[PDB]
Amino acid sequence: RLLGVVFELQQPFHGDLVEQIYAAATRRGYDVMLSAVAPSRAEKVAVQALMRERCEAAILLGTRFDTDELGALADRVPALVVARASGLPGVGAVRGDDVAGITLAVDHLTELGHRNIAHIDGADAPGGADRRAGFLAAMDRHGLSASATVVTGGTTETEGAEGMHTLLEMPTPPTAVVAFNDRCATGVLDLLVRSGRDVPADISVVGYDDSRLARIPHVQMTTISQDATHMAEAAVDGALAQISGDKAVDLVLAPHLVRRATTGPVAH
Amino acid sequence: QASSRLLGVVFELQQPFHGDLVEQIYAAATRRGYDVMLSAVAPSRAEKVAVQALMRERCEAAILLGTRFDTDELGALADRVPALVVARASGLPGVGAVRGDDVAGITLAVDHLTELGHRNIAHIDGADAPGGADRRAGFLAAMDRHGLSASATVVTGGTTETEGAEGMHTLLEMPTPPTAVVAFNDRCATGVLDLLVRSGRDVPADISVVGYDDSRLARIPHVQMTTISQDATHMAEAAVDGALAQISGDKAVDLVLAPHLVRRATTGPVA
């Protein structure tokens, strides 16, 4: 028996999810067929490749498929999306509570004394809208709506670095930054150290995903974990349940704060 | 039903260079009318488990990227399906291989650095990872050719940013730290650069750094890492053709490809 999985080849978070989906699938007696998405291999191609095999289900990690696309897919095989809502009643989803996640980051920073906090969003990437919304609501909750900045970013290191550059040029640069994800925060960190600014002595930085990048010994990035192990187990069980005939579900998992060494007392 | 031919590909999840090779293999495969079935290797999923997984499929060949299988494991695999390893020698007749000329590659790195005036040059090797021994021997040979055997340093490293950092730390503690460092691969170099910048040292002003693979890490706009390319696209096409050739019944070949230097901003004249 086979479960189809579409993931992004150069994405750390998808790497964790995939490794965990393989283990969950095996525990359930299922094999996995991976179909990679890459700059030269569109998601439509990767998804279409799984259709060429005996996949009993299709699990799309952070898919950018529109409602029509997912509908067309759901018409051919049980489908479930990971790290984002499906938008369609018949397409299941296993995602992280992005709004609660970002809120943990902000709460953590305001508790350390930070008032001027910025966010480098993930643009139109899955989860970007929610974290952006969560960031703003979280700052408001602390009565810091006035000192909250949001700059467009992305999912890569460059967008992280450009975002941080932009922020440093602000009339009043932030003392803390919440990057869209870990790869993005890596870029933020790289720019800060090269610019003579110490983390956290001068600026605190928080990432998202708790990927291999965050646990690197000399980086020790504070970040939000989405619990890749349970998300993967839920995704697999979710797909196997839809295969059995059960109704598609929108499961939201709670994230947790992972404190390392990139955040600390606000300066001065 | 038999109108869709499969090529099996075993690779390391989250390994930059395997990601580049996989992307290109998919493309080369498609150009030849073949689909690709990936089977990933990860800490919780042994390469042995990944290969058996491919066996439960209709793969007409198995392409292993940087495999760690010994003669016996490879042999057993070759007895079930034509096989070809990438980025290393098979060490077995009947098992094809498509790899870069590691000795030649590191020699380019060394020639580039000595040409820029560097003499105290260090190499953080890849330990026992595929390519490790060759780049280490190639490094020492090249240093000797330039009359620098007495100012050549080799420290045991690895393939991750952590070994890069640790190896660089070790090198900085030395009586006579090196002015240039050739890392095993780009990910290792990433750690070297991370440590150097956090230590207040400028690259290349104070110290020059060279990576290997020319992976996405090296081209990142703010990293701009001088590195050695293995030409992933050509390596991927060659691996696919070698596999399709072995399926056609042709004898297994050990194809060695020439690498080239890709200069960016992490190397420069010696301080």
DSSP notation for B66-81? T----HHHHHHHHTTS
Angstrom distance (rounded) from CA A119 to CA A174: 9
Sorted by sequence, the CB contacts under 8 Å of residue A102 that are 6+ apart come out as A119, A130, A131, A134, A135, A138, A178, A208, A224
Q: CB atoms < 10 A from the CB of A229, how many?
A: 17
The one-character DSSP state at B271 is -
The secondary structure element, H or E, covering residue A74 is helix A67-74
For residues B183, B187, B193 and B196, what is the CA-based torsion angle, rounded to 10 degrees? -80
Angstrom distance (rounded) from CA B29 to CA A97: 39
Q: Using the structure block, give the residue that is written with the tokens 């280490």.
A: B136
Nearest CA-CA partner of A186 in A149, A157, A164, A209: A157
Subunit contact A49:B27, Cβ cutoff 8 A: no
Question: Is residue B271 exposed (0-12), middle (13-18) or buried (19+ Cβ within 10 Å)?
Answer: middle
The DSSP code sequence of B21-69 is HHHHHHHHHHHTTEEEEEEEEBTTB-HHHHHHHHHTTTEEEEEEET---
Q: Amino acid identity of A13?
A: F
3-state secondary structure at position B241: helix
Contact B212, B138 (CB under 8 A): no
The DSSP code sequence of A99-116 is HHHHHHHHHHHHHTT--S
The bridge status of strand A79-82 relative to strand A92-96 is parallel
Question: Is residue B139 exposed (0-12), middle (13-18) or buried (19+ Cβ within 10 Å)?
Answer: buried
Angstrom distance (rounded) from CA B14 to CA B144: 36
CB of B225 within 8 Å of a chain A CB? The answer is no
Angstrom distance (rounded) from CA A196 to CA A199: 10
The length of chain B, given as a count of residues: 271
Note the resolution in Å, 1 decimal. Answer: 2.1
Query: With contacts defined as CB-CB under 8 Å, which chain B residues touch A19?
Result: 13, 40, 42-45
Q: CB atoms < 10 A from the CB of A116, how many?
A: 18
Map A226-261 to HEC letters. Answer: CCHHHHHHHHHHHHHHHHHCCCCCEEEECCEEECCC
Query: C-alpha angle with apex B16: B11 to B22, nearest 5 degrees?
Result: 45
Please give the distance of CA B270 from its chain centroid, rounded to a whole number: 27
Query: With contacts defined as CB-CB under 8 Å, which chain A residues touch B14?
Result: 12, 15, 212
Cα-Cα end-to-end distance for chain B: 64
Angstrom distance (rounded) from CA B29 to CA B214: 22
Domains (ranges, CATH) in chain A?
1-97+226-255 (3.40.50.2300), 98-225+256-268 (3.40.50.2300)
Q: Which two tokens stand for residue B179?
A: 């002015």
Nearest CA-CA partner of B8 in B219, B271, B234, B240: B240
Scanning every residue of chain B, which has its alpha carbon at the shortest distance from the alpha carbon of A229? B44
**Residue B5: strand pairing partners:** B34
Q: Using the structure block, give the residue that is written with the tokens 């070790």.
A: B170
Angstrom distance (rounded) from CA A17 to CA A80: 14
Contact A151, A118 (CB under 8 A): yes
CA distances from B248 to A119, B61, B64, B215, B255 (A): 56, 11, 19, 32, 17
Contact A220, A194 (CB under 8 A): no
Is the peptide bond between B204 and the residue preceding it cis, with omega within 30 degrees of 0?
yes
CA distances from B154 to A2, A91, A241, A243, B222 (A): 47, 55, 55, 56, 28
The one-character DSSP state at A41 is B
CB of A134 within 8 Å of a chain B CB? The answer is no
Contact B138, B173 (CB under 8 A): no
Scanning every residue of chain A, which has its alpha carbon at the shortest distance from the alpha carbon of B16? A10
The one-character DSSP state at B151 is G
Angstrom distance (rounded) from CA A187 to CA A183: 7
Q: Which two tokens stand for residue B149?
A: 């055997």
3-state secondary structure at position B86: strand
Angstrom distance (rounded) from CA A105 to CA A108: 5
Subunit contact B27:A19, Cβ cutoff 8 A: no
Angstrom distance (rounded) from CA A88 to CA A33: 24
Q: Using the structure block, give the residue that is written with the tokens 């990438």.
A: B86
Subunit contact B162:A217, Cβ cutoff 8 A: yes
Query: C-alpha angle with apex A252: A250 to A255, nearest 5 degrees?
Result: 160
The bridge status of strand B180-183 relative to strand A148-151 is unpaired
Q: Which two tokens stand for residue B263?
A: 């200069």
Contact A101, A208 (CB under 8 A): yes
CB of A42 within 8 Å of a chain B CB? The answer is no
State the method.
X-ray
Angstrom distance (rounded) from CA B13 to CA A211: 13
Subunit contact B220:A191, Cβ cutoff 8 A: no
Angstrom distance (rounded) from CA B244 to CA B7: 9
Q: Which of A33, A194, A216 sits opposite B162 (nearest CB)?
A: A216
Angstrom distance (rounded) from CA A25 to CA B157: 35
Angstrom distance (rounded) from CA A95 to CA A83: 4
